[PDB]
Design an enzyme around this catalytic site. Structure first.
Site, PDB file in Angstrom:
ATOM      1  N   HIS B  40       2.909  -3.321  -8.204  1.00  0.00           N
ATOM      2  CA  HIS B  40       1.979  -4.254  -7.564  1.00  0.00           C
ATOM      3  C   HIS B  40       0.499  -3.972  -7.877  1.00  0.00           C
ATOM      4  CE1 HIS B  40       2.086  -1.286  -4.160  1.00  0.00           C
ATOM      5  NE2 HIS B  40       0.817  -1.632  -4.068  1.00  0.00           N
ATOM      6  N   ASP B  84       9.270  -0.917  -7.406  1.00  0.00           N
ATOM      7  CA  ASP B  84       7.816  -0.957  -7.463  1.00  0.00           C
ATOM      8  C   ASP B  84       7.273   0.187  -8.334  1.00  0.00           C
ATOM      9  OD1 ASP B  84       5.207  -1.777  -6.951  1.00  0.00           O
ATOM     10  OD2 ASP B  84       5.172  -1.003  -4.908  1.00  0.00           O
ATOM     11  N   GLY B 175      -5.656   1.160  -1.119  1.00  0.00           N
ATOM     12  CA  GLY B 175      -6.434   1.818  -2.150  1.00  0.00           C
ATOM     13  C   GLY B 175      -5.731   3.061  -2.682  1.00  0.00           C
ATOM     14  N   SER B 177      -2.276   3.021  -3.263  1.00  0.00           N
ATOM     15  CA  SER B 177      -1.127   2.539  -4.049  1.00  0.00           C
ATOM     16  C   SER B 177      -1.096   3.033  -5.482  1.00  0.00           C
ATOM     17  CB  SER B 177      -1.075   1.020  -4.080  1.00  0.00           C
ATOM     18  OG  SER B 177      -0.369   0.515  -2.965  1.00  0.00           O
ATOM     19  N   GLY B 178       0.104   3.343  -5.956  1.00  0.00           N
ATOM     20  CA  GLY B 178       0.267   3.819  -7.317  1.00  0.00           C
ATOM     21  C   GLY B 178       0.030   5.314  -7.443  1.00  0.00           C
TER      22      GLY B 178
END
Ligand SMILES: [Ca+2]
Lengths: 7, 223
Positions: B40, B84, B175, B177-178
């Site tokens: 995402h 994801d 902020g 994420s990933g």
């Protein structure tokens, strides 16, 4: 929800 | 990161910042030319920033490299957030050193109770917004699947795991994420989603990297 900006 | 602490400049060498004129997601360097992040977090015009601490100031040690290609998992479902995960290939290899280093992929999955380190430049407030300049860190344990499924009935897939604190107060947030969830020197998770941030009985949900090692390897091998 998702933790990006802002999904 | 809510309720975390300042990591210390370059103490998390595999942490990267995805930038499109501003920081929007984290990522993990897995080799000199590949980064793992969340599906995402995908968007065009991504610049990967390595060796960062203060994301608003050039302090030295930074390496800005453009993404040559972003590979979102073919089976990523934006509704359920299943699968994801995204691989980013760098236009040129990063120069690995003490401040910029890759993190290992797991050989096996982590069990409940395993203590991990989550890091990122995301929001530090559960009620409001406050983005830090420097990298934040949080130590959190992987929760049992039963507690995870009790917190999010019908939303947890076999490719997800919960990590955090049910009492609230400490969690990843917008902020982040990933970003990486590293346990025992292995990349076990990718920051993905949650209901709010640091809320009671609503832990963070992460992509279970151990389920994707074969895919990651096969994909890198052919690209
Ligand atoms: Ca900087």
């Amino acid at each position: 929800x998702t933790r990006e900006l802002y999904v | 990161i809510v309720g975390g602490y300042t990591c210390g400049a370059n103490t998390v060498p595999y942490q990267v910042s995805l930038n499109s004129g501003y920081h929007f997601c984290g990522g993990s360097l897995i080799n000199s030319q590949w980064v793992v992040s969340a599906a995402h977090c995908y968007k065009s015009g991504i610049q990967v920033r390595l060796g960062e601490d203060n994301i608003n100031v050039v302090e030295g040690n930074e390496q800005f490299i453009s993404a040559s290609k972003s590979i979102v998992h073919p089976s990523y479902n934006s509704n359920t957030l299943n699968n994801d995960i995204m691989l980013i290939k760098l236009k040129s290899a990063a120069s690995l050193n003490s401040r910029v280093a890759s993190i290992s992929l797991p050989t096996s999955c982590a069990s409940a109770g395993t203590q991990c380190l989550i890091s990122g430049w995301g929001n530090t407030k559960s009620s409001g917004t406050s983005y830090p300049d420097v990298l934040k860190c949080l130590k959190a344990p992987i929760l049992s699947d039963s507690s995870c499924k009790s917190a999010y009935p019908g939303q947890i897939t076999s490719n997800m795991f919960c990590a955090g604190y049910l009492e609230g107060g400490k969690d990843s947030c917008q902020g982040d994420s990933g970003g990486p969830v590293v346990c025992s020197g292995k990349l076990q998770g990718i920051v993905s989603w949650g209901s709010g941030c640091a809320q009671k009985n609503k832990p963070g949900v992460y992509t279970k990297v151990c389920n994707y090692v074969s895919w990651i390897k096969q994909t890198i091998a052919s690209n």
